[PDB]
Design a protein around this ligand. Structure first.
Ligand SMILES: *[C@@H]1O[C@H](CO)[C@@H](O)[C@H](O)[C@H]1NC(C)=O
Ligand SMILES: *[C@@H]1O[C@H](CO)[C@@H](O)[C@H](O)[C@H]1NC(C)=O
Ligand SMILES: *[C@@H]1O[C@H](CO)[C@@H](O)[C@H](O)[C@H]1NC(C)=O
Lengths: 106, 99
């Protein structure tokens, strides 16, 4: 409706008998391919991303926001638990880091 | 000619021009739109088509309507079956009903 791409903002300009809209949009640019999983199996529990998506570069699993590659360590603050590992099709085994555990250890 | 109104129309100067796009070209456009949607979700509408597994795209769409994505993943077979039945009903209705 307001240009091609994800609309950021628009600026009007008058014209003879009409209007011109300068639409400013965000266009994703340099895509890379990754392995993906719908959920992560850890301690017999299924973890789903709170806001992003699980990705793998080949050896390591991260969670990233969906529109811009920004890999982060998969933690309990990054994900939420729902059920066990037996239902989700394509669930992948990986560790989920608990921030409170090192603090309790130290 | 007597049993056809088109011949009388033509003989009195009234003609029909063909559309620029053929039916085959329009079907190609719709198949391209469908392939983009089912392989890349809404990404191809905003830029390059970014592939994503279809169940994960459905999890995205479930988030879009305020349902957590574990609901999609834990009910994936049921949701696929419901969609398949609904498509079959569309096809049966188009085959049977006449207008
Ligand atoms: C990206 O695609 C290439 C081409 O098929 C493949 O060899 C590679 O393993 C993929 N990378 C990931 C992280 O999936
Ligand atoms: C994946 O990323 C980790 C951490 O950034 C790195 O140690 C590992 O070598 C990477 N694996 C690849 C690029 O295959
Ligand atoms: C994931 O871990 C569980 C329990 O340790 C195991 O039963 C299952 O086979 C593992 N999956 C894969 C793909 O190794």
């Amino acid at each position: 409706f307001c240009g091609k791409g994800y609309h950021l903002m628009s600026f009007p300009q008058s014209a003879p008998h009409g209007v011109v809209f300068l639409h400013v949009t965000y266009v994703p640019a340099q895509e890379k391919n990754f392995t993906t999983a719908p959920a992560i199996c850890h301690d017999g529990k299924a973890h789903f991303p709170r806001e992003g998506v699980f990705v793998s570069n080949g050896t390591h699993w991260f969670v990233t926001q969906r529109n811009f590659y920004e890999p982060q360590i998969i933690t309990t603050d990054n994900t939420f638990v729902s059920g066990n590992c037996d239902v989700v099709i394509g669930i992948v085994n990986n560790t989920v880091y608990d921030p409170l555990q090192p603090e309790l250890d130290s | 000619a007597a049993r056809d109104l088109i011949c009388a129309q033509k003989f009195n100067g009234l003609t029909v021009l063909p559309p620029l796009l053929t039916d085959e070209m329009i079907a190609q456009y719709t198949s391209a739109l469908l392939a983009g949607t089912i392989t890349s979700g809404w990404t191809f509408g905003a830029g390059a088509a970014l592939q994503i597994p279809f169940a994960m795209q459905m999890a995205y769409r479930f988030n879009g309507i305020g349902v957590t994505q574990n609901v999609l993943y834990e009910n994936q077979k049921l949701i696929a079956n419901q969609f398949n039945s609904a498509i079959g009903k569309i096809q049966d209705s188009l085959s049977s009903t006449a207008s």
